[PDB]
Amino acid sequence: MDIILGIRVQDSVILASSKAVTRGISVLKDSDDKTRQLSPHTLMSFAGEAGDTVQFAEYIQANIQLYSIREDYELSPQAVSSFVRQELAKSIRSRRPYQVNVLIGGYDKKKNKPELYQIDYLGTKVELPYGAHGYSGFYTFSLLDHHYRPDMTTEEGLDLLKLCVQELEKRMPMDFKGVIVKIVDKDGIRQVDDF
């Protein structure tokens, strides 16, 4: 799929993902949720080749849910991101690789810190204050480089995110039909239903 954004503020991680799904000529859907909850305090958004994206995301989800039951314990965002990276790093030298890029937003309950990880289909992992995949960063990073502060509130993070989406809606040729926004904090995962 197309645009996926992420921003880590003071006490939460915010992920924004486009709603459009395009089958070449036509837009088949304009309400698609490009994300999966891996654990109560860990969310993963994704974008890449059709089919592979959901197949990969659900496979990861199943594995983390299996771990949670076996140990009666939630893995840290860092631990989840490493597991995901290894799967993609394994995938890139397979017969047919997963063509999937992901953002992992999680709140570490031990350290009481939000964390945002950016991983591409090759298995290239980086921890960032804000990140993106595809052409999304080309339009948004200049705004984020200017306005971002590490002590931002969740409301300030959403406002900076709106400015990013407005710039995308102005200068991008494709109509991505807006974004679904989700927040990850100490209380878990919730969706902002008006954006």
């Binding site: 089958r23 000529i25 036509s26 088949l28 859907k29 059709a50 089919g51 959901v54």
Partner: protein, 212 residues
């Protein structure tokens, strides 16, 4: 090819054309593009004819095995996912499919899943697939409401295929209608496009560009 399916108050309408071509040559005008998976589930045929036929009657076999083992009707979600997981195993090998898996159960209500040979599986309210899909979308989008009657919904599906059959060179022949209820699907006949066009033109006042 033009195939559509949409959710509404009274269940699901499925409508398809009947034409098959090999290049410019019209091979058949009497093709069946609705696969009757079982008495409760329907699938549409677009892309590869064999791939859709073979794997959707296979799907029917898997659904039958499920309800024997679990003593319960299979969900549309589970049925669609068996098909999508199967074609995903073959990804790269050259399968060609674009289909709507349609059903109506207690727990879900009327449900439609678009399933693709590159692995895509999407739940939705309105889907339209084929070379004439854009023409059918136009009529659907401007006339669709949730509170359509069964009679008006059936006509909307019939009219949308006609729109595609007229403009799209590779769509036509005849229109096959289906109405999916919770107690199973109901067939609503075969309608020749040649006869249907003139009937609709006169009664509706549409197609003034065409002399009749």
């Amino acid at each position: 090819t033009t195939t559509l399916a949409f959710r509404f108050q009274g269940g699901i309408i499925v409508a398809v054309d009947s034409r098959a071509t090999a290049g410019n040559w019209v091979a058949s005008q009497t093709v069946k593009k609705v696969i009757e998976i079982n008495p409760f589930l329907l699938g549409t045929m677009a892309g590869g004819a064999a791939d859709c036929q073979f794997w959707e009657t296979w799907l029917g076999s898997q659904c039958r095995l499920h309800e024997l083992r679990e003593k319960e009707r299979i969900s549309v979600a589970a049925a669609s996912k068996i098909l999508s997981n199967l074609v995903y195993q073959y990804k790269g090998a050259g399968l060609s499919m674009g289909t709507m898996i349609c059903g109506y159960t207690r727990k879900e209500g009327p449900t439609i899943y678009y399933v693709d040979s590159d692995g895509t599986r999407l739940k939705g309210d309105i889907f339209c697939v084929g070379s004439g899909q854009t023409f059918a979308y136009g009529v659907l989008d401007s006339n669709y409401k949730w509170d359509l009657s069964v009679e008006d919904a059936l006509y909307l599906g019939k009219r949308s295929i006609l729109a595609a059959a007229h403009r799209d060179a590779y769509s036509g022949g005849s229109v096959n209608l289906y109405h999916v209820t919770e107690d199973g699907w109901i067939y609503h006949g075969n309608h020749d496009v040649g006869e249907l066009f003139w009937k609709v033109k006169e009664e509706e006042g549409s197609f003034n560009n065409v002399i009749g």
